[PDB]
Amino acid sequence: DIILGIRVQDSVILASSKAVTRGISVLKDDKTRQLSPHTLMSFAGEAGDTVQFAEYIQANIQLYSIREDYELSPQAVSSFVRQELAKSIRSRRPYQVNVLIGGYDKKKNKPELYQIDYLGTKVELPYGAHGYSYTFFLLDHHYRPDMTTEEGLDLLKLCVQELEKRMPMDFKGVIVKIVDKDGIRQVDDF
Amino acid sequence: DIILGIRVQDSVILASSKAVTRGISVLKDSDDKTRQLSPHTLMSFAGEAGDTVQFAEYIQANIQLYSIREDYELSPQAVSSFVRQELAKSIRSRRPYQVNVLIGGYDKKKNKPELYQIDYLGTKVELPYGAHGYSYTFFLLDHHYRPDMTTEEGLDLLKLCVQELEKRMPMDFKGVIVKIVDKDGIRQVDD
Amino acid sequence: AGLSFDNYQRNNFLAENSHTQPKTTIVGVKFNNGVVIAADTRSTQGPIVADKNCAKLHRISPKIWCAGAGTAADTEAVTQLIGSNIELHSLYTSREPRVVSALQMLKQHLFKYQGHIGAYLIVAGVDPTGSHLFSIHAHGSTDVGYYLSLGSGSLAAMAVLESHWKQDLTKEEAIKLASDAIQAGIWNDLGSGSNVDVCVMEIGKDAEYLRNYTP
Amino acid sequence: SSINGGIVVAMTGKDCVAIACDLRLGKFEKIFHYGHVFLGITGLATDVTTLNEMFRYKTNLYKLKEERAIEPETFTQLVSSSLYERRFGPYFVGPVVAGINSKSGKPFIAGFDLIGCIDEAKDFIVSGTASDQLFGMCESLYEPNLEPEDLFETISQALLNAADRDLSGWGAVVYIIKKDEVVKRYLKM
Amino acid sequence: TQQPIVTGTSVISMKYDNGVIIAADNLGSYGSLLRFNGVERLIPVGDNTVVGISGDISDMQHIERLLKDLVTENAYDNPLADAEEALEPSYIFEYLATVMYQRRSKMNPLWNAIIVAGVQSNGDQFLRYVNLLGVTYSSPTLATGFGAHMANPLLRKVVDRESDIPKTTVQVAEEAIVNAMRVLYYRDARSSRNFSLAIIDKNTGLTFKKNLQVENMKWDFAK
Amino acid sequence: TQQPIVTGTSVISMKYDNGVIIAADNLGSYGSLLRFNGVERLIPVGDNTVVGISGDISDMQHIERLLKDLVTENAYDNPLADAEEALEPSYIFEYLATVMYQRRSKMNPLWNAIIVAGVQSNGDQFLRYVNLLGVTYSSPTLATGFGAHMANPLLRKVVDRESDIPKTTVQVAEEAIVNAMRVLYYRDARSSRNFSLAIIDKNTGLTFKKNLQVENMKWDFAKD
Amino acid sequence: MNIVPQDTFKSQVSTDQDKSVLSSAVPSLPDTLRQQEGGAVPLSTQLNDRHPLESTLKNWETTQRQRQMEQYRQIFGIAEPMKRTMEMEIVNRTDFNPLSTNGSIHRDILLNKECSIDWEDVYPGSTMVGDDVHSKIEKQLGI
Amino acid sequence: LKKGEVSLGTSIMAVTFKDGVILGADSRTTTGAYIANRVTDKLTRVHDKIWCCRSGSAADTQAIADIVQYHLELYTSQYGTPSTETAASVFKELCYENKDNLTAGIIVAGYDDKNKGEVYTIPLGGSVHKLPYAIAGSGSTFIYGYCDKNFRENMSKEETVDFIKHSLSQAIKWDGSSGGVIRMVVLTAAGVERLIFYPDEYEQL
Amino acid sequence: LKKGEVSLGTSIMAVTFKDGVILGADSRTTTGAYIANRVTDKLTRVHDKIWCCRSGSAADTQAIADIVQYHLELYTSQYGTPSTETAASVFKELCYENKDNLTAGIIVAGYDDKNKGEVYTIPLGGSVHKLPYAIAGSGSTFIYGYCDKNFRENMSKEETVDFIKHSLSQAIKWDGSSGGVIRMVVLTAAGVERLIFYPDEYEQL
Amino acid sequence: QFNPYGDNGGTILGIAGEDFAVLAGDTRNITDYSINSRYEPKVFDCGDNIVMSANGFAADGDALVKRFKNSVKWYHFDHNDKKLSINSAARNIQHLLYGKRFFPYYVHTIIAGLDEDGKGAVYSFDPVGSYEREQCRAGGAAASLIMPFLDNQVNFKKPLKYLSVEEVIKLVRDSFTSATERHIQVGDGLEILIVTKDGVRKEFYELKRD
């Protein structure tokens, strides 16, 4: 499971691997949940626990949106996720989980990207990744805050080409989604 | 390390992969997994670094000494038996090391190709097929093998096996070196 | 409620995956009309001297004092909790606290936690029944002694005490003997050093706390 | 995304204090304030964030009840008790408290172990992963009763010397605290 | 050996203005059982050297055999064995320390701690310590085991530095040693009341006192 | 408990034509130390039942307390609990076996081996065995510990089948059990020369002999 | 007559063992949203890897009081433990303060803790679901 | 035992004689090879004429003894002076019911008008044994034979005192965990008498 | 101590008296709790008036004793009757030089016209000690006091016999690994005497 | 299993000057909490104006110094009393240390002297023989306290070249005094050996704890 995220001047681009499930032959995006109409969550980690956690978070955020008739901010959503993740492992052995939260804050009119690790450490980032043995050299060299959506997609494509060179053909590909002022879209053709 | 051996009506075909030891960026053009034991006997090996090369070069030196002494070439069967004896002798008083050997020869006296496989404990088996390393290819080989295959058909079968294997290798599978042993000696396939 | 067990599994997991969890001479001497407690004043975080003037004599109550070794946070917390209990009991009974009462409270509290609270204490005091000196172990066992030593420098101090102790000691003789034991611990033990703190509790008088008695 | 560890240094001046922390240049700072009391935490980042949130909670409630800001000594006692509550599951942190009492005007610094044992220092406190090399640098550089400019220069030089001896995007945040004015400075190396 | 079985506890020694004093108790303990009373743990090697050994008793007897062989080989065949060709404390200690380090390096150590005390031919005092690891050191006061934690702080009160040696008489040093032995008998569970002492003086020679008992013990403060 | 501390060695019992006989030695050993001598390990429960216990002595005393409680509960508001409503060996064994299995399933066993011997109200012999795991079985001869390896071969030569029971008199059975006790004292290091014996007969009713000693010992051939 | 708490482990488990948070859709399964535990806490994880002292601390006071009741029964009779338990039950039942968790004065008087402090007192010990008065009303009344 | 806990390496004796009972012990507490207390009082009073000595874990035995003394005060307020058998039963129940968590062994010596002085022993595990005389502790193993050769029933007070003194002197001589003074309590119809003997007395026996 | 080996759990005594020496032992060999040999002669002769008893590993002590007997035969062929000190020295050398591989303990008793009866003991480890009397084995721990209270120098033959009989009877009574008959060898100038005592005799002491 | 190693807890410092070298060390020998001796030298004159120190396990350091001195004796015997240079001594010590590659000495070694041009030279050795020439090297406990003190007052890049011997001695004494104040294993004395063209000179200074 590999997840990637890049924040460009007016958008957030999240990429997730398609499917790897033990030794089961499947044909068939199971690693993303839409928390809010302008907030998307990508997760990667241990099978079973991670999906339970993501669905729990989604149910809570939908309950909040229904109760208040209002959309929670990406920062508040990230804080709630961090609190819940820290609380879940307070009385049990920790499980592998890594989360990227990407949103578009309407009040500030800005894209936002956050990364939360398995212990509950939240970091606001311009770019982030998990699951790859790095790619941070290319991101460090070829990233600017004022990049457009097309330039961010080009950087993501270069990163994906780098990834798909030491991976087997069993690596089917990557699904790309974009969060911006109009909501959440899936990059189908590209 | 992956080694494949296919015996056909008139020859033996051996395919071997490159090393890529541990995080070392190496650009080179050579085969470090194959030693020519004699003009009509070739050996491919796969296993632990250091030990396997030492054993292969020791075997090659012994066989070259025999060839110089007798002015005569041992048969592939005798070569394989000597290799099995030496391999069983090496681990006589030490912890066994991982090693797998494919010996492909052409018996001139019998005028026929032969292929043997020896594992790390010293088990020698005469086979029409053979593979070591990545673990399906047995099913494909069983489905598409005939004892009377020509060299071209054997090469096509080897290409099919390579294409099947490449789809599971992590895209670092470089050019597999392929050699042919027959009545004219040993040659390397450019493709 | 109480001390928490949350993040125990998480801390064990971090310890298994190579995450380092981050991490004294005391004597008590009775004399003919009271008791003295003395201690060194060096505080070290390992081999590094964190503080050259550290107060190690702690007050359970105005005339009941104690010093400790082992886990410092546990020692301080247990001393403060028992001090609160002693003060409340004294207000409830309208009487001066007894040293035996503090001994019982400390013993039962330490036995409840089955040795997981690492508090090793020397407790001296004076109450309307007389003067008392006690040693208290982490697992909940207590003992009574005329002279006691504690800490890493306790063997040198005990040697000095065994050399120069008598049944009938004046206040000055006891103060000198306790100071000498602490000085032996200071000179001959790497964990002890700097100055000496003394507290003298005499029957019928206020407790006298002499910080930096000998520098 | 890796922000664990770090270094925090606190020093006392004439009638001022200085508290400085390392930074990665380029939003995660390890120094927080709750009025006129400053707290710097090193160690596990999740525990740092959790402790900051808990202490903001408790100091807000304290100010709502007391109708006055909390003093450095009372905050030190609060931090000690909070750390001791998690006796068997402690946070992996080293905290340092600095400030100036609003009434007496005396400067105050202190450090803590992971279960709340208090180390009240009169000269300086060093918290961090090594705490042996920067400790020696601070010991060699520190002098008592410095003026705020002298104290700022001393603590900045200690941080720079620590940074040089074992990087690329290293930065520092320094706070010079007086009874009436607090100055926040960045060091870009 | 690989683990001690029968052991002795402690040897304590001090320098004074004209010589050295050494002392050790007479007990070989078998675990927690006080099995053997009457074990001499001070070995006089010549008339100018005494060796005190603590630890494994079988290894101690082996060391005694080595010392006897050394003495016998000194006289083979020098007619001046009693003359200026007699063994010096430094020679004996150098040999013993070499043996201890060599056997440590062989993974077959002699589980002992050894103090060599004596007077050189020029009147100088010699006092040295070596253990099973081959660690050697010297000091105006020396002790092994529990004594190193209890007897040493007492004796360092009398002789705290090298300048205190000329100011210390034999009477004061012997009194300090006897008091330290009493403290050890008070606070050591593997100790004995009976002990032996040895004085080496550059004028009067060697005085070896046996069957010395701890006396004047305060037990009356029962209640 | 988790490990036995003070223990008794073995209990041996056999059926004869008109009753049962059970015996056990008087010793409580502390490791290899033969610490406690006057220990009674045969407990008569009523006029027609004897329970013999080997193993942990503290658990044996706990079981004795349980048996006394059962006897007192049987007589609670029971005027007929002397002849008609008295306890029976099958009742006592069923209760004890239930206790043993339940405490095995609790991972807190009673480290004992127990033999219940007696005569039912209809004249049938009863002889059954239960151990710390809850394993129960019956046989014309029973023994625990070292006796189970040495006394049983001697006893099975007298009563080999169910059809040998009517042919065995009380004298023969008692002599066989005495010989087995002597052999145990010969070859058991944790054994004692003193033992208690109990005869339960459907006619006489009960005979509890204490302070019996192993006699007629062959030691003279040690001269050679 | 226990001192250390005994018999603390659970001898069996089930998916409906917690009757408070049972799901309405599937009554045999628990409701993970209303548990508000983090969403990834199976019950089986609570059966392993516990601190060996947690059970001793949780049940210490109850064990001491049970020993005291047993002593009263042995020495005084059945009536004394009966009356003590009756008093404690009456005090505990007639207290319902959903906005506070502090114990009552009368309970501490009955427990002889009028002037005694423990870490439970010092450390008495946000959410979208189930943090309201009505949940406590339902739990108290068994609705 | 628990790691780092304090053990009780004692020498305990209790002997019944014509007029009552005598309970004696040494006074050493150790932490391995170091003597942490030269003079400890090992004779614990549980009631006016019911005394005991303890072995095993020190903390566990102290807690058990405190609970038993509380129990005997409660019993006394209701029915008066308890028998030694009742105290032994309470000790046994406490030791047996907690034997999976606490290590404890007790020797109980008592006097009462009905039974005229009794000795009970409760070894590790919680079983109870009533004996004419009992010995326990690390040093007791060295005097099993001697006592067995020198005990008689219905001895006088002086004979019992001498017997206990000799036995404990040998136990002190051979055991490294047994120490300086010998403390004894004599329980008869007259009252409670305390005796102490010093090393210079018994070491010359 | 290698797993599955045979250990010498026994009770060994050797006492010097007015006319010579006496060596006594029990006759029990146990594997675990099973008495593998009910009648064992533990009194090993290495020379006409030099006898020994063994403890520890049975195989190691048997090999050492065979080598010692061979050594003493060579010595006798060269120089005549050896002293007990020489045999003790050979035993000590064998036990000490191999202590990292063998577990052996020896009690040596001897007589000669020069030294007039001697006892040496070599415990585990290889050290040698000369004593007026010695006790060894698992059952000796229970008679450390009794012997220390009942030994006198220059006792007559009958007094020594009674002392050894009483002490070994107590050791048999208390030690599980000890039992059977008592065997004794009396070494004097008049020759070698053999004695055996049966349980029906010594158990009534 | 028997553990053949130990730790004795010292502190050493070597400084190379313009035409002199200095090797200093604290004189306290301890066993992990106790003071074995308050005066036990660890810096030794080895002949041919070479000073050596092996800090750590004391037995290993004594053995290494003994072997080096014997080797120097044989070197004088076999080469017509030729003076052994500092680089040759460094190579000899490297071979001596690496000869125990699979059972290493548990020491840190520093040697000091003058090179063939008359300038001061200091060599530092890793426990298995890796060595290099350095201007200043602090080893043992409290090295992290001593190096910053020296760097605060000396520009190794007043420049160290123009410093005199007395100034270096004073600076070493000051650094050791500070370390003694801050560290529990440092104290009881400091001994300094100075190597110049006139030979080796010894200085002693009392530290805290007497």
Q: Which domains does chain E have, with CATH numbers?
A: 1-223 (3.60.20.10)
∠ CA F170-F175-F178, rounded to 5°: 125
Between chains, do F58 and H127 touch, taking CB under 8 Å as contact? Answer: yes
Which pair of tokens denotes residue A68?
A: 């208040």
Distance CA F144, CA I148 (A): 41
Give the helix, strand, coil percentages of chain B, each rounded to 5: 30, 30, 40
Distance CA H178, CA H25 (A): 9
Whether residue I154 contacts residue I34, with contact meaning beta carbons closer than 8 Å, is answered with: no
The structure was resolved experimentally with cryo-EM
∠ CA F159-F163-F169, rounded to 5°: 55
DSSP conformational letter for J125: E
Question: Exposed (0-12), middle (13-18) or buried (19+): which is C171, by Cβ within 10 Å?
Answer: middle
Between chains, do G115 and C85 touch, taking CB under 8 Å as contact? Answer: yes
Residues of chain G with C-beta less than 8 angstroms from the C-beta of H102: 3-4
Contacting partners of chain E (3+ CB pairs under 8 A):
C, H, I, J
Measured in angstroms, the CA of G142 and the nearest CA of chain D are apart by 34
Whether residue A45 contacts residue A96, with contact meaning beta carbons closer than 8 Å, is answered with: yes
Residue of J nearest to E149 (CA): J34
Distance CA I158, CA I160 (A): 5
Residues of chain E with C-beta less than 8 angstroms from the C-beta of I125: 1, 4-6, 56-58
Distance CA G4, CA C112 (A): 8
Phi, psi of G112 (to 5 degrees): 60, 40
Distance CA F129, CA F106 (A): 21
Terminal Cα-to-Cα distance of chain C (whole angstroms): 45
Number of Cβ within 10 Å of residue H152's Cβ equals: 10
For chain H, say whether G3 makes contact (Cβ under 8 Å): yes
Which pair of tokens denotes residue H3?
A: 């790691």
Which pair of tokens denotes residue D83?
A: 């750390």
Q: Which of D86, D112, D129, D137 to mutate to test the interface with C (most CBs of C within 10 A)?
A: D86
Which residues pair with residue J13 across a beta bridge? J24, J138
Q: Which of E181, E180, E210 is nearest to E198 (CA)?
A: E210
Contacting partners of chain H (3+ CB pairs under 8 A):
C, E, F, G, I
Residue with tokens 């006055």: D68
Give the helix, strand, coil percentages of chain I, each rounded to 5: 35, 30, 35
Whether residue J176 contacts residue J26, with contact meaning beta carbons closer than 8 Å, is answered with: yes
Contacting partners of chain B (3+ CB pairs under 8 A):
A
Distance CA F127, CA F121 (A): 14
For chain C, say whether G7 makes contact (Cβ under 8 Å): no
Between chains, do C51 and D92 touch, taking CB under 8 Å as contact? Answer: no
Whether residue J184 contacts residue J30, with contact meaning beta carbons closer than 8 Å, is answered with: no
Partner-chain residue, chosen from F34, F189, F217, that has the shortest CB–CB distance to I174: F34
Measured in angstroms, the CA of F90 and the nearest CA of chain I are apart by 34
Question: Exposed (0-12), middle (13-18) or buried (19+): which is J190, by Cβ within 10 Å?
Answer: buried
Partner-chain residue, chosen from C141, C145, C155, that has the shortest CB–CB distance to H59: C141
Asked whether residue H103 is assigned to any structural domain, the reply reads: yes
Contacts of residue D138, Cβ cutoff 8 Å, sequence gap at least 6: D9, D11, D124, D126, D158
Residues of chain E with C-beta less than 8 angstroms from the C-beta of H138: 32
Between chains, do G123 and D85 touch, taking CB under 8 Å as contact? Answer: yes
Residue of J nearest to E3 (CA): J2
For chain H, say whether C128 makes contact (Cβ under 8 Å): no
For chain J, say whether D158 makes contact (Cβ under 8 Å): no
Residues of chain C with C-beta less than 8 angstroms from the C-beta of J210: 187
Residue of B nearest to A162 (CA): B171
- Paired sense of beta strands F141-143 and H29-30, if any: unpaired
Please indicate whether residue E1 is annotated as part of the active site.
Answer: yes
Sheet with strand F19-25: strands edge to edge? F141-143, F11-15, F19-25, F194-201, F207-213
- Quick check: helix, strand or coil at residue D149? helix
For chain G, say whether D85 makes contact (Cβ under 8 Å): yes
Distance CA E137, CA J41 (A): 10
For chain C, say whether J186 makes contact (Cβ under 8 Å): no
Residues of chain C with C-beta less than 8 angstroms from the C-beta of A119: 10
Residue of C nearest to H102 (CA): C114
Asked whether residue H61 is assigned to any structural domain, the reply reads: yes
Whether residue D24 contacts residue D169, with contact meaning beta carbons closer than 8 Å, is answered with: yes
Contacts of residue I93, Cβ cutoff 8 Å, sequence gap at least 6: none
Between chains, do J34 and C193 touch, taking CB under 8 Å as contact? Answer: no
Residues of chain C with C-beta less than 8 angstroms from the C-beta of D121: 50-51
Task: Tell me the residue length of chain E.
Answer: 223
Distance CA D42, CA D128 (A): 6
Among the listed residues C24, C25, C41, C79, the single catalytic one is C24
Measured in angstroms, the CA of C59 and the nearest CA of chain E are apart by 27
Distance CA D54, CA D51 (A): 5
Resolution value in angstroms: 2.3
Between chains, do J33 and C44 touch, taking CB under 8 Å as contact? Answer: no
Which pair of tokens denotes residue A185?
A: 């879209």
May I ask the CATH class of domain J1-210? alpha beta
Asked whether residue I2 is assigned to any structural domain, the reply reads: no
∠ CA G100-G102-G104, rounded to 5°: 115
Q: Which of C145, C125, C144 is nearest to C64 (CA)?
A: C125
Partner-chain residue, chosen from C162, C165, C188, that has the shortest CB–CB distance to E152: C188
Which residues pair with residue F137 across a beta bridge? F129
Number of Cβ within 10 Å of residue A171's Cβ equals: 16
Give the range of the structural domain holding residue I96, as residue numbers without chain letter.
7-205
Distance CA F136, CA F93 (A): 10
Number of Cβ within 10 Å of residue A118's Cβ equals: 20
Q: Is the dihedral of CA I137, I141, I146, I149 positive or negative?
A: positive
- Quick check: helix, strand or coil at residue H76? helix
Tally of domains in chain I: 1
Q: Which of H34, H39, H182, H194 to mutate to test the interface with E (most CBs of E within 10 A)?
A: H34
Which pair of tokens denotes residue G36?
A: 């508000």
Q: Is the dihedral of CA I40, I43, I47, I48 positive or negative?
A: negative
Partner-chain residue, chosen from E33, E190, E219, that has the shortest CB–CB distance to H180: E219
Ordered by start, the domain boundaries in chain J are 1-210
- Paired sense of beta strands A11-17 and A32-36, if any: unpaired
Asked whether residue I118 is assigned to any structural domain, the reply reads: yes
- Paired sense of beta strands H129-131 and H133-137, if any: unpaired
Between chains, do J148 and D132 touch, taking CB under 8 Å as contact? Answer: no
Distance CA J108, CA I122 (A): 45
∠ CA B160-B166-B171, rounded to 5°: 160
Ordered by start, the domain boundaries in chain D are 1-189
Residue with tokens 């957030």: A12
For chain E, say whether I128 makes contact (Cβ under 8 Å): yes
Asked whether residue H2 is assigned to any structural domain, the reply reads: no
Whether residue J50 contacts residue J60, with contact meaning beta carbons closer than 8 Å, is answered with: no
Contacts of residue A121, Cβ cutoff 8 Å, sequence gap at least 6: A82, D1, D3, D4, D45, D46, D49
Between chains, do C92 and G114 touch, taking CB under 8 Å as contact? Answer: yes
Between chains, do H78 and G2 touch, taking CB under 8 Å as contact? Answer: no
Asked whether residue I1 is assigned to any structural domain, the reply reads: no
Contacts of residue J48, Cβ cutoff 8 Å, sequence gap at least 6: J72, J83, J84, J85, J89, J113
> In this structure, which topology does domain D1-189 adopt according to CATH?
Glutamine Phosphoribosylpyrophosphate, subunit 1, domain 1 (3.60.20)
Asked whether residue H59 is assigned to any structural domain, the reply reads: yes
Residues of chain C with C-beta less than 8 angstroms from the C-beta of E182: 162
Measured in angstroms, the CA of D51 and the nearest CA of chain A are apart by 13
Partner-chain residue, chosen from I141, I149, I173, that has the shortest CB–CB distance to H146: I149
User: The domain that contains I97 carries what CATH number?
Assistant: 3.60.20.10
For chain H, say whether E146 makes contact (Cβ under 8 Å): yes
Distance CA D59, CA H19 (A): 73
Q: How far from I66 is each of H141, I57, I101, I187, CA to CA, in Å?
A: 35, 14, 17, 21
